[PDB]
Amino acid sequence: SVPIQCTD
Amino acid sequence: VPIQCTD
Amino acid sequence: VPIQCT
Amino acid sequence: QLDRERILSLEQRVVELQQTLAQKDQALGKLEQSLRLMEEASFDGTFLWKITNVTRRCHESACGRTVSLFSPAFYTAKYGYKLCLRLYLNGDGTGKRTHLSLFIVIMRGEYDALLPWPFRNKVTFMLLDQNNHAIDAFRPDLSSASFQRPQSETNVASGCPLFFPLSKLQSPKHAYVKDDTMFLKCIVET
Amino acid sequence: LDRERILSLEQRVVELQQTLAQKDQALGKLEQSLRLMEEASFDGTFLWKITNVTRRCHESACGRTVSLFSPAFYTAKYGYKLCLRLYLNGDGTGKRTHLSLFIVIMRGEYDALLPWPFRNKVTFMLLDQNNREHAIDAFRPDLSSASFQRPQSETNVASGCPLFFPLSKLQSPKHAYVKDDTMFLKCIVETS
Amino acid sequence: QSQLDRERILSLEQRVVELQQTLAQKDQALGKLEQSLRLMEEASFDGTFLWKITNVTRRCHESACGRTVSLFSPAFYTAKYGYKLCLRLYLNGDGTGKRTHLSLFIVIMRGEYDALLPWPFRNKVTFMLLDQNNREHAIDAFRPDLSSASFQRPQSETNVASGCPLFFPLSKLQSPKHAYVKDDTMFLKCIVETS
């Protein structure tokens, strides 16, 4: 339940 | 009683 | 306290 | 010679601009209509239909070209059933020349793949009286194709063909048609 | 006979410019309609975002801008049609001294079914971008005033608070009533 | 007159050019208005959003080919005056989930009222892949990472998309117990804690 950012 | 329309 | 707009 | 050729080219360009501009005008019409429909929609199973020019539409049902009138679509929920109303001011089937007919119409929804079928939500119709009230209600016939999952854009309209006598609408004691305007209220239980 | 063809072309070109201009106008009106639907509220609570506050204050200080009309918001999907009238320059007893915030009862498509006169309590609120202490006023509609009767025209005469908020306190930095040329008004109409 | 006819022809050519340019520009404006109406029709304001993806095989092949790297959902909101949100979907996958999983991220967008909302974003976010047979939905959920700049007040119109890669393995799409893709369509559902 921890977000993982995208490659952008 | 719901009755259908003649469409 | 309504006041008519003038 | 060549100047006249320039004139001809300008003529062709002008015609092209005329027809193109006409197409853009049609697109504007479609967009304005879609905007109106989006404005009219409700998303809680309750819908209030305002019919204007009731007399002209009555002549447009007894002798006019329009067989029936279709309300803007509404929904039981944001991702619920898509529904609309079909109205016969001069009546339909048995109801014609005596009553006004009012049918619910289950329309093809973008989320029908997630909805239960057949549609069993109780439906309630009302004719509103400003002076204050007609009302009917029914459980949907689950054995009819009207309430199965739509295979087309809409299913067969189903409801009450003897919803309201035409004579009582003209009557003065009630205000069902006030200023050539009547209000039909549909409540789909959720 | 090139003159005849050239004059006919001139006619059709001027016609295309006129009609094209009318279509551009209609398109602009459609865009404005979309903006009006985007900011319409149907629960009696409306939040009004005023941008370019300094510029609009200069416009109100001159004769070109008198007041601002908020987008229409509704007490319910089939309820009363309302909008707001804002004087950044003031009005009446509040001219040149206060913000004047009035409410406008408009002609609704379904108001033939609504109770009259309009009696719902009205609450105005100038919002502090900071955590607290934003300005709050509230009033009961004067039922004897013609501004709350059923609209026999498109809109009734606005009624509200001409002394709503002092213009002097707007400049003060203790409260963030204006931040980046943007302030927020809030109208809360009681459910009834 | 010979001179008058040449002058009128030339000026008429200029007028036709002006008309073509302006007509094109207003056509583009009309397209933008159409897309905007579609966007506000798709929007929801209660924190939940049901994203319908049609032609899943074609779009998936476009993601594997690279023609469309990711997809963006219409913007939805937690409230009428709450947070502007949307979704970013990688069919091929992003990062660790690349080529193996569906990668599903939420996007905090610059809402018109961000000044009145508390920051950083902290509302619990729930992603679901809906089984059209109602056997088993694919559910994941997370609390927003406060130290990440993806959940702060947006400076531009959009923050860096933040969510869960590896949200759903592509092998389970064509699952024997239940197919999440039915009639070449699938449904993603996002539920944000509106409190």
UniProtKB/Swiss-Prot annotation, chain E:
Organism superkingdom: Eukaryota
Domain MATH: 43-189
PTMs per UniProt: Polyubiquitinated by BIRC2 and/or BIRC3, leading to its subsequent proteasomal degradation. Ubiquitinated by the SCF(FBXL2) complex, leading to its degradation by the proteasome.
Binding partners and assembly: Homotrimer. Heterotrimer with TRAF2. Interacts with TNFRSF1A/TNFR1, TNFRSF1B/TNFR2, TNFRSF4, TNFRSF5/CD40, TNFRSF8/CD30, TNFRSF9/CD137, TNFRSF11A/RANK, TNFRSF13C, TNFRSF18/AITR, TNFRSF17/BCMA, TNFRSF19/TROY, TNFRSF19L/RELT, XEDAR, EDAR, Epstein-Barr virus BNFL1/LMP-1, TANK/ITRAF, TRAIP and RIPK2. Interacts with BIRC2 and BIRC3 N-terminus; a single BIRC2 or BIRC3 molecule interacts with a heterotrimer formed by TRAF1 and TRAF2. Interacts with NFATC2IP, TRAFD1 and with HIVEP3. Interacts with MAP3K14. Interacts with GPS2.
Domain notes: The coiled coil domain mediates homo- and hetero-oligomerization. The MATH/TRAF domain binds to receptor cytoplasmic domains.
Annotated function: Adapter molecule that regulates the activation of NF-kappa-B and JNK. Plays a role in the regulation of cell survival and apoptosis. The heterotrimer formed by TRAF1 and TRAF2 is part of a E3 ubiquitin-protein ligase complex that promotes ubiquitination of target proteins, such as MAP3K14. The TRAF1/TRAF2 complex recruits the antiapoptotic E3 protein-ubiquitin ligases BIRC2 and BIRC3 to TNFRSF1B/TNFR2.
Protein name (database record): TNF receptor-associated factor 1
Species assigned in the record: Homo sapiens (Human)
Phylogenetic placement of the source organism: Eukaryota, Metazoa, Chordata, Craniata, Vertebrata
Gene name linked to the record: TRAF1
Range of the intact protein held here: 224 to 415 of 416
